[PDB]
C-alpha cells in the first residue's frame, strides 16, 4: 500500500560519519551504529509528496528522463524501467550537453536516425569490414544516445541514484529550473537538488525498493499496470 510500514524494511547504512551538515536539515540525529543511517517517517511523507507531484506532472504529458550509471545493478534496473514503458533513459555515463546545448546533439541524434534508416534499407552495400565498422558506430551511438533517441523536447524531470555520482547531470539540470528527484544520502548536496529522498544506496536492498517506488510514480500516470505502492504483498529482491 501507499507508504505502508511493510515497504520500509531496510534503508539504513552509509559512510562512517561523513555527513554533510546541510542535510541534518532533513536527517535524524546522529546514529549510534558506527555508520550513518536514515529514518523512514520523513522518508515516506516525502515519498508521498514526490509520488503525487511527479504523477500529476506526468499526467500533463511531460518530458521525463532517466539515468543510472553504477556498476551493474542500477543499469539493469533502469533497463527494466525502459522496457516496460517507453520513456527517455540513460544507461551509461552521459557525456552531457542537452539542457546546456541540445541543438548540437540534435545533429548527432538526427544522424543516428538517418543511419538506422540506412541499415533498414541496406542489404549488401557494405563488405564485412565496412559492415562491422558500421555496426560498431551504431553501438557507439546506442550506448550513449539510444535512450534519448525519441525526443526533441528537453526533459523537465529526472531521477538519479546519487547527485554526487552524477554531478554533471545535476549541473545540467541547474541550467534551467526544472524539478528533479534524487536518491539522497548524508554526503550529497541538498541545495543543488529540487526533490530530496534521503535513503540508503550503499546497500542495493534499499536502492531497488526506491527505484520501484519512483517507477510506480511514473507508471500509473501512463496507465500501465503498477508494481508496488498498491500491492499488499512484497517481492523479495537481491543482487545476483
Amino acid at each position: 500500500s501507499l507508504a505502508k510500514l511493510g515497504e520500509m524494511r531496510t534503508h539504513v547504512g552509509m559512510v562512517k560519519r561523513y555527513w554533510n551538515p546541510k542535510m541534518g536539515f532533513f536527517i535524524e540525529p546522529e546514529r549510534k551504529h558506527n555508520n550513518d543511517h536514515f529514518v523512514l517517517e520523513l522518508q515516506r511523507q516525502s515519498l508521498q509528496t514526490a509520488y503525487n507531484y511527479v504523477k500529476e506532472v506526468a499526467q500533463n504529458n511531460g518530458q521525463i528522463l532517466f539515468v543510472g550509471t553504477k556498476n551493474d545493478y542500477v543499469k539493469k534496473l533502469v533497463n527494466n524501467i525502459a522496457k516496460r514503458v517507453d520513456v527517455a533513459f540513460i544507461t551509461q555515463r552521459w557525456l552531457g550537453g542537452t539542457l546546456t546545448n541540445f541543438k548540437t546533439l540534435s545533429i548527432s541524434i538526427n544522424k543516428l536516425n538517418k543511419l538506422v534508416e540506412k541499415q533498414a534499407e541496406n542489404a549488401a552495400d557494405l563488405t564485412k569490414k565496412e559492415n562491422l565498422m558500421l555496426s560498431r558506430e551504431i553501438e557507439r551511438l546506442e550506448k550513449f544516445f539510444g535512450g534519448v533517441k525519441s525526443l526533441k523536447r528537453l526533459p523537465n524531470l529526472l531521477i538519479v541514484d546519487d547527485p554526487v555520482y552524477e554531478k554533471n547531470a545535476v549541473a545540467e539540470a541547474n541550467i534551467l529550473r526544472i524539478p528533479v528527484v534524487a536518491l539522497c544520502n548524508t554526503n550529497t548536496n541538498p541545495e543543488l537538488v529540487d526533490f530530496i529522498i534521503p535513503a540508503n544506496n550503499h546497500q542495493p536492498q534499499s536502492t531497488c525498493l526506491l527505484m520501484n517506488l519512483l517507477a510506480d510514480a511514473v507508471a500509473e500516470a501512463k496507465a500501465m499496470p503498477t508494481m508496488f505502492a498498491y500491492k499488499p504483498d512484497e517481492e523479495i529482491q537481491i543482487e545476483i
Partner: peptide, 5 residues
C-alpha cells in the same frame, strides 16, 4: 516550483 498544470 509548484506543479506544471
Amino acid at each position: 516550483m509548484g506543479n506544471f498544470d
